[PDB]
Amino acid sequence: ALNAAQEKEVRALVRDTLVSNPEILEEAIMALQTKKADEQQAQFRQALASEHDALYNDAASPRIGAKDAKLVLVSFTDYNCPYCKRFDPLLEKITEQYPDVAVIIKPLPFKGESSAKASQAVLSVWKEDPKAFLALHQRLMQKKTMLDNASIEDAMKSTNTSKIKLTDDSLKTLQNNLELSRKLGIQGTPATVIGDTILPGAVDYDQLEIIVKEQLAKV
Amino acid sequence: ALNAAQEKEVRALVRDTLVSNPEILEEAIMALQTKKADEQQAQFRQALASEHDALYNDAASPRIGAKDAKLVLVSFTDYNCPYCKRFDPLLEKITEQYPDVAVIIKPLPFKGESSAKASQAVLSVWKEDPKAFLALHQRLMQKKTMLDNASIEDAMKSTNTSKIKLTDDSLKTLQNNLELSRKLGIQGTPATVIGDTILPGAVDYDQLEIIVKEQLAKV
Amino acid sequence: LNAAQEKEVRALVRDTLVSNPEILEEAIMALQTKKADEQQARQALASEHDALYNDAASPRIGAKDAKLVLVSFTDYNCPYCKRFDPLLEKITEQYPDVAVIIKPLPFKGESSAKASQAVLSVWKEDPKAFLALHQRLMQKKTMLDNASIEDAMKSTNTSKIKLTDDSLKTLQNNLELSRKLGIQGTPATVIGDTILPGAVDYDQLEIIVKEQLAKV
């Protein structure tokens, strides 16, 4: 053992050490990144059921894939999130390889104004010209640099959506995405809803393919 | 209480433990998501506790399944609700496949006049002749268009309950269900209490099996 | 100290966190403000001068006394990074006055963090072997996994080198760095006072390097 008083001082040092040096946390996160484990969460079934219509029946939420689809994934993502930029082509590839599968995008504004603006832009484009959304979506994901208004205008120009107005209705959609994320325990991106579980972060295509196939099976 | 060299060393052992063993972090994350999920559900669970006798001990509320079941679902349903019609067979299937599980029906007058009349009919049947309840319950639930005077009467004719009087007392039980739905936050049908969670809509058999199995284990 | 007590501290770290998730929620909050403190889209590369150019743990391709040092933020699993790396190398080959520092990033997932651990670990212990492993991992056309990484390290005489936990500290520093410079994707190359935001034609790259080299 060790002094019953020393025990409680170690417990406090665990708290003070982590909160004061978040690089410790971020390195621990880096360490967890090297472990190939899907960290699927089932803590939120009730909340997912309770929010079914907000997840899957919101016409303002862009869709990649078939409206006909048998399985719909919900991607909570941020156009400025580096892991998001890399995880999205995997999600896209699922819909290409499994046409029975579609992905609903829920953009989030976590990394600031330009995230909010990009979110606004794609949501607006989706509402006015659904078929032009995917190109703009991809173009934003390809930006290697922190977005700003200039680089968003460029993305819209090179994807012929520059003439589409960013609307106020789209911001209501964005605030829904946010409150919805709040309720599903989603505090980081990318988070992916696949049936009853949430995939709290990005995974390898191999792991994603298996998870889709298992849920695509259940229906 | 603890020297400076050991404070210095407990602090360094925080970083090392977490970075060397990311699994600790993963546990801590799950623990947190569980905390979140539980806190978001606390109001609902308090209500479930407060309305326990109205939920589980009202002899006027019909039951499908063993009176001594280990687990009792509570189905808030409406005979004119088309999703209730798709879902009810799944709830029945659970009692068929899992004899330790029973379902209590809470009929609701949500969709209109014939919803109140249909609820009154099955509640009235249940109390006079419980054995005769289920065939009528099934029959009304099978009807595809909204019920009216004639189809409720035909439903009772084909299930030999036509000669059972629809009581005023049966309406006390109906009003009780309304009260119960308000206090539990049930603002639509179907809704199912399963242990300490509530399914707020129709879900496929598999997803319902998983919740029932899980809640059955915790007993 | 005291090896027995040290065992308990380790188990306390786990039990304290798992039994009180609120500590983790504070810590994430603390991390949030950290990421806020850093994020920023002729600005921040200047502040981050020592991080950029004087990290011993950061691998270098080219002369140690080079007059121009490009900084390559890159990912071993990123196809555009795989195609662009040979071009940055060719620059050092054709312009021995130009060196390239490598900042591996984990953006494309679990193998990217491992590939990054391997090269940073090899650079600390066996710097002579870094370049061979770097090109090897960059020349694989499939997603890295544990097998192809081990296979790549055998081929380059580095299979006896442990992938350290300390190299993750460096990998997290690269994450910090890219936040402060507004680098959200790969490849991205720092050249003088400007950041080249993707894969470009060699001819284009050459022109920019040649001008910055003359600015010195």
Residue numbers in the entry:
A (entry chain B), B (entry chain A): 4 to 222
C (entry chain C): 5 to 45, 48 to 222
Q: What does the paper behind this entry write?
A:
The N-terminal residues bring three catalytic domains together into a trimer, and a unique flexible linker enables extraordinary twisting and extending motions that impact on the catalytic domain placement.
Moreover, the compact and transitional conformations were determined from crystals grown under similar conditions (2.85 M sodium malonate pH 5.8, 20 °C with either 0.1 M cobalt or copper added). Nevertheless, comparison of the eight compact and the two transitional trimers in these two crystal structures, reveals an unprecedented level of conformational re-arrangement (RMSDs>20 Å). In the transitional PmScsC crystal structure, each of the two trimers incorporates protomers in three conformations: compact, extended-like and intermediate. The two extended-like protomer conformations of the transitional structure are similar to the protomer in the extended crystal structure though they bend at different points in the linker helix, giving rise to somewhat different catalytic domain placements. The two intermediate PmScsC crystal structures are asymmetric flat triangles with dimensions 105 × 40 × 70 Å3.
